[PDB]
Protein: E(rns) glycoprotein
Organism: Bovine viral diarrhea virus
Amino acid sequence: ENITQWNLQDNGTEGIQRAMFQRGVNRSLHGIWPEKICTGVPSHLATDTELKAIHGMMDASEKTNYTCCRLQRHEWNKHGWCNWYNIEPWILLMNKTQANLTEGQPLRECAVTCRYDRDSDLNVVTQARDSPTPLTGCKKGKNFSFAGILVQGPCNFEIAV
Ligand SMILES: *[C@@H]1O[C@H](CO)[C@@H](O[C@@H]2O[C@H](CO)[C@@H](O[C@@H]3O[C@H](CO[C@@H]4O[C@H](CO)[C@@H](O)[C@H](O)[C@@H]4O)[C@@H](O)[C@H](O[C@H]4O[C@H](CO)[C@@H](O)[C@H](O)[C@@H]4O)[C@@H]3O)[C@H](O)[C@H]2NC(C)=O)[C@H](O)[C@H]1NC(C)=O
Ligand SMILES: *[C@@H]1O[C@H](CO)[C@@H](O[C@@H]2O[C@H](CO)[C@@H](O[C@@H]3O[C@H](CO[C@H]4O[C@H](CO)[C@@H](O)[C@H](O)[C@@H]4O)[C@@H](O)[C@H](O[C@@H]4O[C@H](CO)[C@@H](O)[C@H](O)[C@@H]4O)[C@@H]3O)[C@H](O)[C@H]2NC(C)=O)[C@H](O)[C@H]1NC(C)=O
Ligand SMILES: O=c1ccn([C@@H]2O[C@H](CO)[C@@H](O)[C@H]2OP(=O)(O)O)c(=O)[nH]1
Ligand SMILES: O=c1ccn([C@@H]2O[C@H](CO)[C@@H](O)[C@H]2OP(=O)(O)O)c(=O)[nH]1
Ligand SMILES: *[C@@H]1O[C@H](CO)[C@@H](O)[C@H](O)[C@H]1NC(C)=O
Ligand SMILES: *[C@@H]1O[C@H](CO)[C@@H](O)[C@H](O)[C@H]1NC(C)=O
Ligand SMILES: *[C@@H]1O[C@H](CO)[C@@H](O)[C@H](O)[C@H]1NC(C)=O
């Protein structure tokens, strides 16, 4: 039911993806998304010490030099507080998910957004998730590159039939 999405390295894509490439990071968690989006005052303000505990997750914000904690706080506020109720189980979940992503190619990895590279003739995956979704920037009949791993389809498993 919850969508897990993450960023993948790509020097050709300015922002988080280029920063990950330079830092030798292959996969960095974006968020864990239940159906219910949080509205209003969070039940708890996510501190930098708390958010830093999700080891290896990079901020999408250039203002923190892609470290912590603008993306992390935004994720707790928009998707965390109203569904997890307390910060401790959400940090342990976000951190276990990132620790799993750092290991390499996940069991379920589907492209979300691409940057088509004319030189290598590949759909360089900039964001992926654990379930298939309509693509953005991915060119039809071109193979996908998930932080170096070549896959002919949009997922590292079969969807169709
Ligand atoms: C998918 O995403 C959902 C969120 O939409 C996740 O579900 C949440 O899981 C967390 C645990 O990881 C749950 O948090 C705990 O809630 C306890 C109270 O919950 C009551 O019962 C139902 C649950 O069916 C709730 O819906 C009600 O609102 C009730 O409040 C709460 O007591 C508990 O805290 C205790 O432990 C922590 C430490 O773990 C202490 O810090 C704390 O003081 C206290 O002792 C937790 O906060 C949460 O209830 C779940 N939310 C829902 C809506 O079900 C799934 O886990 C996600 N799954 C995957 C695979 O990603
Ligand atoms: C990771 O991705 C980045 C971005 O795509 C890439 O960086 C680019 O690298 C190229 C080559 O080193 C570089 O090109 C040079 O640009 C200067 C002018 O630069 C100015 O303008 C840029 C915008 O156009 C701006 O980004 C710069 O900061 C700067 O203000 C130009 O003078 C160079 O001279 C030419 O050199 C070529 C050969 O290299 C000759 O054929 C030619 O005649 C000129 O002498 C050259 O074009 C580009 O500026 C970089 N862009 C950015 C954004 O940094 C990295 O290369 C890539 N990393 C890896 C490891 O792949
Ligand atoms: O985790 C993230 C967050 C944002 N982005 C993209 O970077 C820009 C936001 O500054 C935006 O270009 C935004 O595009 P979007 O995510 O909305 O598709 C990422 O790539 N990864
Ligand atoms: O199920 C979903 C799918 C996407 N999103 C948000 O929309 C942005 C673009 O897809 C995604 O980058 C994400 O942005 P965010 O909420 O993390 O700011 C969801 O919220 N839930
Ligand atoms: C991490 O991976 C292991 C093995 O696939 C799995 O048992 C565990 O549930 C995963 N944790 C998360 C947070 O996805
Ligand atoms: C977060 O995950 C890392 C593994 O990358 C682990 O070493 C660390 O103890 C975990 N942190 C918390 C707060 O559990
Ligand atoms: C990134 O991915 C490539 C391809 O899977 C791999 O060769 C490389 O070792 C990975 N880097 C890290 C930091 O795990």
Remarks:
- Residues 3, 31, 33, 75, 78 surround U2P (ligand 4) (CB under 6 Å).
- The first helix runs from residue 16 to 23.
- The two ends are 22 Å apart (CA to CA).
- The chain is about 25% helix and 20% strand.
